[PDB]
Amino acid sequence: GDTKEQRILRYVQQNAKPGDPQSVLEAIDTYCTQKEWAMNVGDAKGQIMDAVIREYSPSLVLELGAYCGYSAVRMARLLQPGARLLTMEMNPDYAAITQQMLNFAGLQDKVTILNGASQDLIPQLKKKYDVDTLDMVFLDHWKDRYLPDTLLLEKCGLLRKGTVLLADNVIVPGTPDFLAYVRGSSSFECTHYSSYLEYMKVVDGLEKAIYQGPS
Ligand SMILES: O=C(NCCNC(=O)c1cc(-c2ccc(F)cc2)cc(O)c1O)c1cc(O)ncn1
Numbered sequence: 745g746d747t748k749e750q751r752i753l754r755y756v757q758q759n760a761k762p763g764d765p766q767s768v769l770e771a772i773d774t775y776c777t778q779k780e781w782a783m784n785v786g787d788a789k790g791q792i793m794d795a796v797i798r799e800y801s802p803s804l805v806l807e808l809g810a811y812c813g814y815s816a817v818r819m820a821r822l823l824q825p826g827a828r829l830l831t832m833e834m835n836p837d838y839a840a841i842t843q844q845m846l847n848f849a850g851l852q853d854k855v856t857i858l859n860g861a862s863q864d865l866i867p868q869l870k871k872k873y874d875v876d877t878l879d880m881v882f883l884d885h886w887k888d889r890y891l892p893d894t895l896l897l898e899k900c901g902l903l904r905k906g907t908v909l910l911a912d913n914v915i916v917p918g919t920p921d922f923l924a925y926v927r928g929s930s931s932f933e934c935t936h937y938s939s940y941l942e943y944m945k946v947v948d949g950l951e952k953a954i955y956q957g958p959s
């Protein structure tokens with residue numbers, strides 16, 4: 745039968761207003777609070793994401809790991825006109841749900857959902873996708889991929905002074921190598937935002953790591 749992610753999309757389509765991103769976020773959070781948990785960033789951490797997005801008003805955001813498109817809705821709804829989000833989702837079924845979710849939210853013109861592995865796609869961003877540098881990166885894919893993909897971003901010349909990395913799940917499931925690395929690096933200025941795992945009474949957190957250039 746249907747998957748959890750199909751159930752979430754359907755619930756959104758039947759309980760949100762088309763073209764209304766806030767209603768989409770609310771529908772998802774209700775579903776996941778009342779019916780079934782799912783690994784969306786959630787409202788607690790989402791509120792911190794919102795605050796970050798509004799501070800930096802990034803023109804170009806890369807997201808690693810889309811899932812059902814919750815975080816992509818969350819960020820894209822706060823982008824300025826003309827600003828854009830690219831999100832890399834290697835799971836094809838998740839990629840399809842994410843696209844449908846963004847279409848329902850009316851945010852399809854702001855977001856490009858690429859179905860491929862981040863390690864394969866990151867090296868194509870400059871030449872294929874005409875990226876110069878990224879303003880912000882949201883990390884939310886496999887937790888053992890945050891560090892290697894961060895180092896790949898730098899290798900490929902995609903980070904600039906001031907590029908904001910914002911990492912989900914640095915407590916649960918945790919990203920110990922990434923977290924130790926950025927906190928130890930003179931090339932990052934880090935801030936920890938303590939919060940809660942989505943839809944749970946469990947502590948989690950976001951890490952912001954602002955790239956400072958080589959050193
Ligand atoms: O990105 C891919 N999976 C989700 C990564 N995200 C997570 O695993 C994740 C997990 C949890 C979590 C927390 C507590 C718990 F008890 C169980 C899970 C929370 C979150 O907020 C996440 O973000 C992926 C899929 C695929 O098929 N191929 C390549 N990549």
Ligand SMILES: [Cl-]
Pocket residue numbers: 783784785786810811812813814815816
């Ligand atoms: Cl999400």
Ligand SMILES: [Cl-]
Pocket residue numbers: 785786787788789941942943944
């Ligand atoms: Cl929550």
Ligand SMILES: [Mg+2]
Pocket residue numbers: 783784785884912913
């Ligand atoms: Mg997460």
